[PDB]
Amino acid sequence: MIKLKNVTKTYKMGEEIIYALKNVNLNIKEGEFVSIMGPSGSGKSTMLNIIGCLDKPTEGEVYIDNIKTNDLDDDELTKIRRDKIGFVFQQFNLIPLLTALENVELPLIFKYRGAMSGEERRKRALECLKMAELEERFANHKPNQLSGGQQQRVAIARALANNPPIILADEPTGALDSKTGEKIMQLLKKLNEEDGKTVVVVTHDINVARFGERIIYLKDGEVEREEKLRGF
Amino acid sequence: MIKLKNVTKTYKMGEEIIYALKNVNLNIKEGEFVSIMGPSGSGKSTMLNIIGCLDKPTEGEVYIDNIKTNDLDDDELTKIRRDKIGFVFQQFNLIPLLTALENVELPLIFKYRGAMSGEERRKRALECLKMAELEERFANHKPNQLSGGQQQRVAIARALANNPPIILADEPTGALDSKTGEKIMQLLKKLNEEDGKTVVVVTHDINVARFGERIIYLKDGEVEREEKLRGF
Ligand SMILES: Nc1ncnc2c1ncn2[C@@H]1O[C@H](COP(=O)(O)OP(=O)(O)O)[C@@H](O)[C@H]1O
Numbered sequence A, B: 001m002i003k004l005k006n007v008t009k010t011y012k013m014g015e016e017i018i019y020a021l022k023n024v025n026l027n028i029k030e031g032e033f034v035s036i037m038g039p040s041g042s043g044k045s046t047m048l049n050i051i052g053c054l055d056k057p058t059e060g061e062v063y064i065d066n067i068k069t070n071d072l073d074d075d076e077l078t079k080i081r082r083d084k085i086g087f088v089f090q091q092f093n094l095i096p097l098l099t100a101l102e103n104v105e106l107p108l109i110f111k112y113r114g115a116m117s118g119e120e121r122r123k124r125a126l127e128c129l130k131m132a133e134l135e136e137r138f139a140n141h142k143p144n145q146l147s148g149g150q151q152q153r154v155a156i157a158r159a160l161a162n163n164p165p166i167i168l169a170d171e172p173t174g175a176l177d178s179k180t181g182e183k184i185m186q187l188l189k190k191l192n193e194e195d196g197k198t199v200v201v202v203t204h205d206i207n208v209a210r211f212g213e214r215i216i217y218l219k220d221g222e223v224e225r226e227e228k229l230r231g232f
């Protein structure tokens, strides 16, 4: 589903051409849990931004579900992200004055404006909140009234919202504790294995990378090696 | 307040190095209404992104209130945008499930978390809504219940919110009609002239550019010329 061919991403700081991704080659299978491991600076997040269609590779070529995103105009690019990708992050990113169920409704508003009813949005939003294994009785609560763990479960239901086959997570458990951090992981595993979601998680903590079928070790902008752990 | 020195912004599309801003030099005085005029492609918005601290110049140097933003880490960069800049755009950008007054509270939440009270946020939010000349009786309304004009008045109160000396507008009246489009302009004029705000507006419609003390004509990434219209 996600595919890369000779991607490079440079950052011109003037006289300093810095390379974040160098001649990187990858191919993520549909419904495959993959993890990008590396220290701060490896180029992990840069890659999560390109695959997420948040950025353009200074070379190479990105394929999302076999579709070359490179030349797509911003409008078309936004159609990709909103339909083909589900985002999650370390920084929860919830709106402070919206109920857990409202934060899940937003993406659905932006995709289906004027098509779906308030009743249908409230329903889908809950299905995704229930799917993200957050008790229904916590739907009406706002951000600061939920455990940091419950908060990530909201970012997850919001990402699952418009039903994207892809889910990218950037150091999702960085903000949590080992115990709840594992539940979230066990949750991405659930989605991938059962629901069939193509999960790609970026991390520096190897313990998280182990939930992936394969870890892709990234070093100073380049892929040092790959590690297959399961599907033999 | 805003200052540029030999800024260039290139976009590597691979074998194609495209230039959006080429060796551009500018200096906006404090409390000065300036307009960047140009056809779609001039490089206007690119410049609005750099001045807004949304992007980094591939060369040159940006000064916001005399402070060089170039080397600032993302955290420090965010402190700049949230404290020194007030954004507005053609695309209103309001959250659909939040009341006009709530959309104005958000920036204040993000800057003053845990410091200010619900009562103080509700007050400042209204002051800015009243300043943006939107009747107080429209505070409790949500987006789709306000005239497109009332909606821009919300983006304006939200921008004025954390009290930024700067206000950048990107084709603010593009989405409106001539009549209400002029009221919004007359409103930025109000802020600049009375309140003392440094207003910089990016546009392709010359009729809007005329509210500026000087128009900066931009052509294919370069400043073709400048036009002083008032302070002689
Ligand atoms: N917007 C940017 N401007 C300049 N350099 C960048 C930018 N984004 C990333 N980099 C560079 O890319 C490298 C790492 O990329 P990054 O996305 O931060 O990955 P990681 O999460 O592993 O640190 C760093 O050396 C950094 O300097």
Ligand SMILES: Nc1ncnc2c1ncn2[C@@H]1O[C@H](COP(=O)(O)OP(=O)(O)O)[C@@H](O)[C@H]1O
Pocket: A056, B011, B018, B019, B020, B038, B039, B040, B041, B042, B043, B044, B045, B046, B047
């Ligand atoms: N993210 C980008 N990637 C590649 N090219 C860009 C990007 N942003 C702007 N450009 C280029 O910059 C030029 C105009 O810049 P832009 O910000 O769109 O200004 P304007 O509003 O006047 O069109 C165009 O030629 C465009 O191709």
Ligand SMILES: [Mg+2]
Pocket: A044, A045, A046
């Ligand atoms: Mg990172």
Ligand SMILES: [Mg+2]
Pocket: B044, B045, B046
């Ligand atoms: Mg533009």
